[PDB]
Design a protein around this ligand. Structure first.
Ligand SMILES: *[C@@H]1O[C@H](CO)[C@@H](O)[C@H](O)[C@H]1NC(C)=O
Lengths: 49, 49
């Protein structure tokens, strides 16, 4: 929700000890580009961090 | 002073090669091994437009 900011004033969300479900997060989105560095794309959705 | 070999229009390369799964939600990249070709050359011709 809300107007997203520009690239030099991005808004942060920190996550520590909470349940995340990207199957209901990214279902509201459509990925145009998906790039990752040092991990696989499937590593986030399964490995506990 | 060597004309027997010719010149193409431009150079071109691939910057992304991934696949969709049956869920149409997740992208799996492919890494070509030594002295073979990724399957994604089957969809792009020798000259990228
Ligand atoms: C293989 O044949 C299909 C049939 O039209 C074509 O779409 C595809 O580009 C061809 N692949 C190569 C590498 O020529």
């Amino acid at each position: 929700s809300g107007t997203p900011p520009q690239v030099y004033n991005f808004k942060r969300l920190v996550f520590t000890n909470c349940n995340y479900n990207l199957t209901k997060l990214l279902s509201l989105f459509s990925v145009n580009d998906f790039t990752c560095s040092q991990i696989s794309p499937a590593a986030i959705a399964s490995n506990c961090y | 002073n060597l004309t027997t070999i010719t010149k193409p229009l431009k150079y071109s390369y691939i910057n992304k090669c991934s696949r969709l799964l049956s869920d149409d939600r997740t992208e799996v990249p492919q890494l070509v091994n030594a002295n073979q070709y990724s399957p994604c050359v089957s969809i792009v011709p020798s000259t990228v437009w």
